[PDB]
A paper describes a structure:
Surprisingly, IsPadCPG eluted as a monomeric species from the gel-filtration column when purified under dark conditions. Crystallization of the IsPadCPG monomerZ under dark conditions revealed the absence of the native IsPadC PAS–GAF dimer interface. In the Pr state, IsPadC and the IsPadCPG monomerZ exhibit nearly identical RR spectra in the entire spectral range. The spectra are also highly similar to the prototypical histidine kinase Bph Agp1, confirming the typical 15Z configuration of BV in the Pr state in the truncated construct. The low signal amplitudes rule out a genuine secondary structure change but may reflect altered intramolecular contacts of individual peptide segments. These structural changes in the PAS–GAF domains can be rationalized on the basis of the present crystallographic analyses of the IsPadCPG monomerZ and dimerE/E that reveal a reorientation of the NTS helix and the switch from the β-facial to α-facial coordination of the BV cofactor during the Pr → Pfr conversion.
Author numbering: 6 to 312
The structure:
Amino acid sequence: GSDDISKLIAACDQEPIHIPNAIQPFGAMLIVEKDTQQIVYASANSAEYFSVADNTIHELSDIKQANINSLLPEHLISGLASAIRENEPIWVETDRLSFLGWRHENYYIIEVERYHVQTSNWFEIQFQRAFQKLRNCKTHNDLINTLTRLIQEISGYDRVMIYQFDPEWNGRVIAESVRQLFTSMLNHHFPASDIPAQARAMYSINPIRIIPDVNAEPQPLHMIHKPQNTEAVNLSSGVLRAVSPLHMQYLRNFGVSASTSIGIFNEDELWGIVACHHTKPRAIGRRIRRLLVRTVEFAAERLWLIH
Ligand SMILES: *C/C=C1/C(=C/c2[nH]c(/C=C3[NH+]=C(/C=C4\NC(=O)C(C=C)=C4C)C(C)=C\3CCC(=O)O)c(CCC(=O)O)c2C)NC(=O)[C@H]1C
């Protein structure tokens, strides 16, 4: 039936991806009522992240006891309080932990990750080399190929592609960089339903989406202290937001174990994405994420100017 097939296609765009009440297990998440300053939701894995800074905490139970001010660094709490704008993430890096938090209505949402030892000035020197290569490009075809190659080198993903939307949100792959033999994806077309409108809109909130392992077990948000409002909390601005299992299976069918995509914007208009696949699971720290986003933004700026 024709209208039935259309119902099914329309269901794609209606899965509530913004409120899964779970996360990917490469970080831990705390949800805290702003006025109560009380921990109301915590990921089922919070223990193994806050046990790195605080040794009193070894179980999810201990988080009901825990105070925010022992768990979170002070600059994080001060920035989150002194922040008026909703959904704009603050980042605070201790000696052991990398925090990203933001305010959404009466909720503070805090994501915490681990990180590797860093090399000073590496972020900036890498961006400098990308800035110079993208700026020396004089046609869009050199620009986009250069972009895929740089994203490939910075991230180390097995495959980096530029996926360009047409006026109806259908898209095609227009450039490719690979770390191994692959059958070409060049000029392969995909329908608009493969990235439903809700996912397309998510790049306007967080321009990078990151999936380190398609088979990693999502961790649900447990209730800690009974929140005033039991509505689902919107997790859109972070990176830990659990992945729609449909898209996980889509990645498996692709032969992919890790994914990362970055929106390509012209002003507020989503023009396309950088799509990144890995055959084995892969994680990339916050600094590689920010470098990728910043590289894509400079490439976009160049893309709208050159012929
Ligand atoms: C009925 C629903 C469907 C559906 C849902 C869905 N898809 C995403 C997210 C993404 N889909 C992407 C598609 C592509 N990746 C590629 O490499 C290519 C072509 C080479 C395409 C077309 C991409 C890139 C994303 C972003 C995530 C990522 O980078 O992997 C979501 C959002 C999931 C989430 O963000 O939690 C949803 C709900 N896909 C379908 O095919 C139908 C069945």
